[PDB]
Ligand binder design. Structure first.
Ligand code: GTP
Ligand code: GTP
Ligand code: GTP
Ligand code: GTP
Ligand code: GTP
Lengths: 285, 285, 285, 285, 285
């Protein structure tokens, strides 16, 4: 029957199915008087509002109340008439060792919710769990997988690397660095200029032209990440597919790099689960 | 059919419809011999005179006989020939959790009154309830909502803050501080000068030139409110729309602030329900 | 030395000391030819007759010539041989902010009077001022103050509520409703039956059987007061002590209520200053 | 010279010095007519009454007018003859990052107050700030710190965990769960039974026998907290010291647990600052 | 001038100089609110806390942020008044091919740090790099180096073997086996007994008597390591010096072996850099 794919992401939860899209992993459970003015869900004795509050930073999100965001994203991907669906969840690569913990709350059960009053329940056909970032592989045709590839997801705080040969994997790694670190570095001196910004509001300010982050600072970040990744891979080799939002930060200068074969694929942020959807096709079809 | 908007306000009830305007939330039910000389309404076994008496200070006005002022304002907004009307009531933000209590007396019923002898009854088409101060949002065009905004209502005893991103809310808060507190502070030493004034008569005395409240005291109040609001928002960010009467107190020096983008919108006191009227247009139209 | 307690009440002045009792707060200063036939006092350039005239309704009785009734009650509580006495006056709860005004005429002075010719003067040992209705607390033993309590004085036009935990207060409030309002409601249709009664003569007529106020109307008043008081207190909780004359109106059906723990204490009308006398014992002894 | 310790707590402020004790963090600043009947303090342009009003729930109490309760507790711990004192304040663990904000109002200054009229001022010798819950450590002798320990404070809405090896810390964490949540869960169905209770009055009702919360519900809460805490610690390991009021809720069944080494220490609620006092001894002595 | 020796070890960093000692290689860079309660260093844009967090297991520690622990150990070995020092670093034997990478960050430069606020900088006189485990050689006198020797370091996950003839080396090898593997084997069935232990906490539990690892299991590990090492060396020949912490695990039964000449030297864990210090004496003196 019908299938959906869900990416829990590093800062944004995201979904594809009969309904497709994304939203921030942002969450709150604090004081309230105007519930109607916020996206909200109450279930399992927990009340939450979605897309606002605190973003959190603790490792292994699977252990700190991910459930509300997960079910909210499921409701988004689904329509009110959905009977039952298959599940292809995704986790940050180095974290899938926690899948069993997820299996505690997830494996082949049925779930109830309210989410503003739509408030129905649904069972899941089956369960698969995959690495975040990696799935990009299956969105690719043989157009470039005819040669060796490197899926490279520039996640908010991380870079997720998996180098693959014919049909198969060759190596994997994670580096704890990301555009959030760049925002922190920028604020280390921009806040010092009599301001009260944060790593969360910053991007909107670069968008509106209120702030003038220098062009060469993005280049500094690019060089830093390249230096970090050198010991494992040759970027010139292993044609690299950039994915994630940070690739959307840096496309304009990634394109300027002297590398041999590479690209920032369209919807690079959602390319991983474009590939996960192709992998789902492979699984069922 | 036709619609009206009503703001219960902090010190003044106010209305817009086929008739528009405002008046103080002031009320009495005390001894009387010249009923004809006072605005008055008798209903539900309660006799009241409007715009005079005691202003009251208790929290949750919804529980201390708001009904007379509400129906009086309805009669003002309506004309004697009105058949039936839709309702868009407003409450102080942190107070809409009491809407259910309001729903006890209000939801889709018909109401009778006397009010000096016009003395007819009317049914209401439907019910919506909204936050006071917030509705300003919908009076704005994309002229400045293209960027992030902050509705900022300097209510008599409070400041009501709601920061909004595209089409949507980002955060909300209230601070229990207002021009009434400034009047109390001024009287803490001005009354001490062998006088018997109050926070109610004071503004008329500054108007007539009888009193000489220093210019820098308004600046002190501005700095106090700015210090109070800092922990949640950056004023330079989130282009701020000042609303409420206190904005009318301080316009002349608000305009002098070093902030980047901001304004005290025309009819700032009634701008919130200018926006509520735009929101009503959005609802029905 | 010896002490007295005085309750100014809502309709009746009242006293306890070497002489104890009560009488209406009724007063006149109008035309006269048979002074000997009326209780009377002339002092401070004011001539008054006690227990007859006009009852008055204005708020803050402390500002409209309470003095004659006060001194008359003092004379009642005292004997002609009294040298000097301590004072424990009482005010309606929300009104003790006017104590300073009372201190203008009262604090530690000596007073002269005539009152039909007894006509002596007396000084007062000291001054304390307490809330009317509340003092009931100290008449109670630990017999029921071992648990949480609620002093509930059903005064002529009001209900005075104070909820107390161990030895201490928890909350307080007033509601402007009373048996006078019930009498007004009854006369709203009973006078309409070609009669000229008032809220003052009515109770005598129910006493003599001339009038047949329905039983269920007292129940309607009970339900109205219960609905009014709900937002602040749980009647089932906070064992309630009914006090005041209206409790004497309603005892027969108060006893029928489904509440858990409660009572209409003996001399409920004077129970408050039974407790004030116990509090005086606590003060001096 | 002399030193004092103050715990701001989650629901109760508390103090030890020449005077020792505790009281609720409850506070009000609302309407008043009988100031003498309430604990009260007026300073810095703010009037407050202590131990009554609203308990508040917002995070980072350091930003919402904690000052009145703090100074009130200082006055309690001190005597009218106190010259100057050292300060060892405490904050909820995850919150001490706000100490700088506290340093804005506190570091080595002198403070004035009224508090019913005692109304003097005092300077502070020095400043230290410590984690709430943790300080229990220093009340322990080597009697059980010879082995690894776990300070475990079951605070009103939280559980505060710090696991310590020889003389030192090993790990720390907070879980947003507490007896307040249990009271909310109990009221989720007990209020539904035609009652108007809250999480605040409930404990008094279990105390008086009016309510019959089932024994197994406390066990359910115990199991829930144990499940929550498992991912970080082994309870059988790291001999656990239960602290806080909730430990006083659950002692009777905590003692029944199958764990190896543990205890609910005497005055578990105040054991943390018993240890903070021992730590003060260590600091100065 | 003065010299220091540093062992990066397998689980513990360690140092000798004007200050001597050791500590775990344990490290974290995660969320924080009580910096003062943890050993910490912030430099080169990286914030870390020492002796707690994650121990890590990846090969070639030189590539995964060893810098914080290294500089922390330098600060330990040095005093606040140190001007400049010589450097004799050590690496796991098979890893010194990475010395050039170390030379990228280390060779004859000056370094800055904060480490809780001491926060000074220092230059290094010169650079030497040596094998971990081997240096034990130079702590020995001719007391037993008159004959052939075998330095044998039973490191946490490894055994490091170097067989030496007169003044010189004869052969070298590493075996990937260690007491960490023994702890993993023990937990393979001890955790299975309804417990949540790890290879890190285990040794403390054997220390406190909570756990009863059988005596013969240490013998099994001894036999396994002996079988592993046989193909290269004769233990009876090449008088063996046991070094490292695991030798401290097994001394009591190592002494029982039927071998001809051998010993577990005092401070076997630090004997290697006792010898490295002797080698430094040889170098400069
Ligand atoms: N320009 C632009 N950037 C975006 C947009 N949405 C997200 N981003 C960027 O995404 C970056 C966050 O890091 P990511 O690369 O997305 O990390 P991640 O692992 O993919 O985590 P997720 O965003 O949840 O998928 C930030 O720098 C954002 O600016 C967008 O709509 N436009
Ligand atoms: N100058 C001037 N000030 C006004 C007028 N009407 C009201 N105000 C001011 O309004 C202030 C009261 O505080 P507000 O900002 O109005 O508080 P609010 O929440 O908006 O409550 P409402 O007045 O009922 O809408 C007082 O300081 C008044 O002086 C006016 O016609 N002229
Ligand atoms: N049955 C009866 N009722 C009385 C008597 N004296 C006073 N009352 C009642 O007292 C009621 C007046 O309201 P109260 O409850 O006394 O109000 P209050 O605040 O106590 O004012 P005071 O009467 O002055 O103490 C009236 O309904 C009277 O009928 C009495 O002797 N017998
Ligand atoms: N039985 C009993 N319980 C108490 C008493 N005082 C407080 N409590 C309990 O304390 C609990 C509140 O949670 P706490 O564990 O105290 O949370 P906290 O972090 O310590 O906050 P504080 O109470 O201010 O110290 C409630 O369940 C109360 O019932 C008491 O005197 N007797
Ligand atoms: N009994 C005891 N054992 C210790 C002590 N310190 C470390 N150890 C042991 O050291 C062992 C770790 O393996 P090692 O032999 O030290 O491996 P390594 O290559 O020397 O790595 P380092 O410990 O960092 O020097 C563990 O089994 C620990 O129990 C100690 O103070 N007492």
């Amino acid at each position: 029957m019908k299938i959906t794919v869900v990416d829990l992401g590093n800062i944004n939860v995201k979904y594809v199915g009969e309904n497709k899209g994304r939203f921030s992993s942002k969450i709150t459970n604090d004081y309230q008087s105007y519930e109607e003015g916020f996206q909200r869900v109450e279930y399992n004795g927990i009340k939450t509002y979605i897309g606002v509050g605190e973003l959190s930073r603790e490792f292994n999100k699977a252990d700190r109340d991910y459930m509300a965001q997960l079910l909210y994203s499921l409701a988004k991907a689904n329509t009110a008439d959905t009977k039952e669906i298959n599940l292809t969840l995704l986790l940050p690569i180095i974290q899938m060792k926690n899948k069993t913990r997820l299996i505690e709350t997830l494996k082949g059960e049925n779930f109830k919710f309210k989410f503003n009053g739509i408030d129905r329940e649904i069972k899941i056909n089956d369960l698969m769990v995959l690495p975040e970032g990696y799935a990009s592989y299956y969105s690719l045709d043989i157009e470039n997988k005819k040669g060796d590839v490197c899926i490279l997801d520039l996640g908010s705080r991380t870079i997720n690397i998996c180098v693959l040969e014919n049909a198969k994997i060759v190596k994997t790694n994670t580096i704890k660095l990301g555009s959030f670190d760049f925002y922190s570095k920028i604020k280390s001196l921009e806040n010092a200029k009599g301001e009260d910004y944060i790593e969360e509001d910053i991007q909107r300010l670069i968008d509106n032209g209120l702030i003038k982050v220098d062009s060469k600072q993005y280049i500094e970040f690019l060089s830093d990440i390249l230096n970090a990744v050198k010991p494992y891979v040759n970027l010139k080799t292993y044609n690299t597919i950039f994915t994630g939002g940070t690739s959307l930060m840096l496309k304009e200068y990634i394109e300027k790099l002297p590398l041999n074969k590479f690209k920032v694929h369209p919807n690079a942020l959602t390319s991983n689960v474009d590939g996960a959807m192709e992998a789902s096709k492979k699984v069922w079809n």
